[PDB]
């Protein structure tokens, strides 16, 4: 089941951004030829998208093929939506509606709060000093996630 993590990481500069694992563009299909590690979407809470196929089929290939993709459309709520990942170069990327009160792009429910997740610190380094509060809210389904707030 770990075979669905896309692993394409071209660190040709020797930055080391892969250590964490070992220790304004709208959401859409993103070809996994450009993914380095987990692809998390935040519907109202964290989910771990894996390498899928275009018809939704889960492919256990680590994202090797040209037509291995991630599917971020397919998790949108019928609401506010964002996803993140680390592309191969190690630059963090974001997809979500444009913004005040309105949420950010990828994991920013607030302009100042972030949905804390297992690879949050890897994807967002500046967020370390943020302290966490717990939240339980309906928006038809009951979600439970953690907030990392500025």
């Amino acid at each position, epitope marked *: 089941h770990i075979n669905r993590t896309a*692993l394409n990481c071209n*660190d040709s500069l020797q930055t080391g951004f*892969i*250590t964490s694992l*070992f220790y304004p563009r709208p959401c859409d299909v993103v070809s996994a030829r450009t993914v380095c590690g987990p692809v998390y979407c935040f519907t109202p809470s964290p989910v771990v998208v894996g390498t899928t196929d275009k018809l939704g089929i889960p492919t256990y*290939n*680590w*994202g090797e093929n040209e037509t291995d993709v991630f599917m971020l459309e397919s998790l949108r709520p019928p609401g506010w939506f964002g996803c993140t990942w680390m592309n191969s170069t190690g630059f963090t990327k974001t997809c979500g509606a444009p913004p005040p009160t309105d949420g950010g792009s990828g994991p920013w429910i607030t302009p100042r709060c972030l949905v804390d997740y297992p690879y949050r610190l890897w994807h967002y380094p500046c967020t370390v000093n943020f302290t966490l509060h717990k939240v339980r809210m309906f928006v038809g389904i009951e979600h439970r996630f953690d907030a990392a707030c500025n």
Partner: antibody
Amino acid sequence: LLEQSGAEVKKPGSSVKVSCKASGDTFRSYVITWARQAPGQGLEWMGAIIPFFGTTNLAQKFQGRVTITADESTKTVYMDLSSLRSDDTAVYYCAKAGDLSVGGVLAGGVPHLRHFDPWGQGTLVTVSS
Amino acid sequence: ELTQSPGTLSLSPGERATLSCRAGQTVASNSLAWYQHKPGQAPRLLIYGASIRASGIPDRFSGSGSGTDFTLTISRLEPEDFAVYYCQQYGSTFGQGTRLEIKR
């Protein structure tokens, strides 16, 4: 520093399993290669392994015959060849191809190769009846 | 797909040993190494990458080459430099090494 196993003598039919003790602390992201040389012929590269992800990809010659595995409980990477021949009676070295953390590798699951700065002592294996 | 030449070399200390390492299909000059192997010892790394000297490698050894062709060179031949020299590409393949011998 890479330590290796003792010289083993095995019958041609049976398999050999030689270890490699690894020094450093980032064992999860070490990419380790095995390769050997024939008393007459030159060096040739068998394959490289990744312990944390358990992914190897090997030369065209030993793609079917050899299996590489690693166990990180003990800082050791193992090396196993089924149905030895006299062609495979040779000297077997262990080399650290690269560190995944700073390697800039792990493309498409399969690991690419980098220079092998540390090299194991080597394990001879005499394969005769 | 590495073609070394010559097979053997025989030179006297203080001479310039020049040894080629060729490729049928072009290599990215990024990934090409040289190794010094002594019997009863473990192979040693001399050049990593392209024209870069590894650590613990005297100044005499010198990498070179771009594209398909490549060369190791030594200007001061010291008397321990007479081991067999393999070249190698990463990605990975070797050549049949060259033997460096003591002219007497």
